[PDB]
Amino acid sequence: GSHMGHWSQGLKISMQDPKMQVYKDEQVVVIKDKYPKARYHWLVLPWTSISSLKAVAREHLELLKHMHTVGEKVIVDFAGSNKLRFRLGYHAIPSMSHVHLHVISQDFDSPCLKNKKHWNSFNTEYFLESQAVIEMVQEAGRVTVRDGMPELLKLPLRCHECQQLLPSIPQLKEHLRKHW
DNA sequence: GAATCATAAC
Ligand SMILES: Nc1ncnc2c1ncn2[C@@H]1O[C@H](COP(=O)(O)O)[C@@H](O)[C@H]1O
Ligand SMILES: [Zn+2]
């Protein structure tokens, strides 16, 4: 198939689709995640093309901080009165091209959350906090990731609120209901 | 039988 039509390039199409945009400014766009893994799941993307955090440098530090500020503003504007819990961060090894910040509510109540890989990509060290990425760029000038990130996606299922171990995705989804 | 694992997608 073509380069432009490859599945890994899909965010570059979605980020230009007005029906998926929830916020736009001179530097970034916010879209709904197409396969949301919680009740609220957005992606913040710069207009400028940066393939992944591997290509980030100090020239991008203001932009990474702006992406974080915009993510916080979207939470306030779209889900603020609910006083929900959110995390903002990056997957250590992404699958989709074009740098994107995940802004995700911590219920993880969604039919698109289907497997252990989904859970652990948001609930282990695989999920890099946005503030931690920002501080690494500021102090070290680039983002580095340690070996062993793919192995974390295989860790047994453990609740993020109470650390209980769960034997299956169905039982995990059932367990999460108690933390609403 | 249900759920996960491990692969494949030409
Ligand atoms: N075309 C798309 N538009 C919007 N979100 C997408 C699209 N394709 C995949 N996604 C989401 O993009 C994210 C890519 O994950 P990652 O590359 O691991 O950061 C996931 O949360 C997907 O659900
Ligand atoms: Zn729990």
Numbering used by the authors: 161 to 340
What did the published study say regarding this structure?
For five amenable variants (V263G, H201Q, S242N, R199H, and L248M), we successfully crystallized and determined X‐ray structures of mutant proteins as ternary complexes with RNA‐DNA and AMP. S242N: Ser242 maps to a surface loop linking α2 and β4. However, in the structure of the S242N mutant the Asn242 side‐chain hydrogen bonds to Ser241 instead. These contacts stabilize rearrangements and an altered loop structure with a 1.3 Å shift at the Ser242‐Cα between the wild‐type and mutant structures. Overall impacts in protein folding are mild (ΔTm = 3.5°C), consistent with a surface loop destabilization of the structure. Thus, we hypothesize that by altering a common region of APTX these mutations may also affect a putative protein binding surface of currently unknown function.
The APTX RNA‐DNA deadenylase protects genome integrity and corrects abortive DNA ligation arising during ribonucleotide excision repair and base excision DNA repair, and APTX human mutations cause the neurodegenerative disorder ataxia with oculomotor ataxia 1 (AOA1). The aprataxin (APTX) RNA/DNA polynucleotide deadenylase directly reverses 5′‐AMP damage (Ahel et al, 2006; Harris et al, 2009; Reynolds et al, 2009; Tumbale et al, 2011, 2014) and associates with DNA repair scaffolds XRCC1 (Cherry et al, 2015) and XRCC4. Environmental and metabolic sources of DNA damage prompt “abortive ligation”, the failure of ligase to complete step 3, and generation of 5′‐adenylated (5′‐AMP) DNA strand breaks (Ahel et al, 2006; Andres et al, 2015; Schellenberg et al, 2015). AOA1 mutations map to the APTX catalytic domain (Barbot et al, 2001; Moreira et al, 2001; Shimazaki et al, 2002; Le Ber et al, 2003; Tranchant et al, 2003; Criscuolo et al, 2004, 2005; Ito et al, 2005; Mosesso et al, 2005; Baba et al, 2007; Yokoseki et al, 2011) and cause variable age of disease onset.
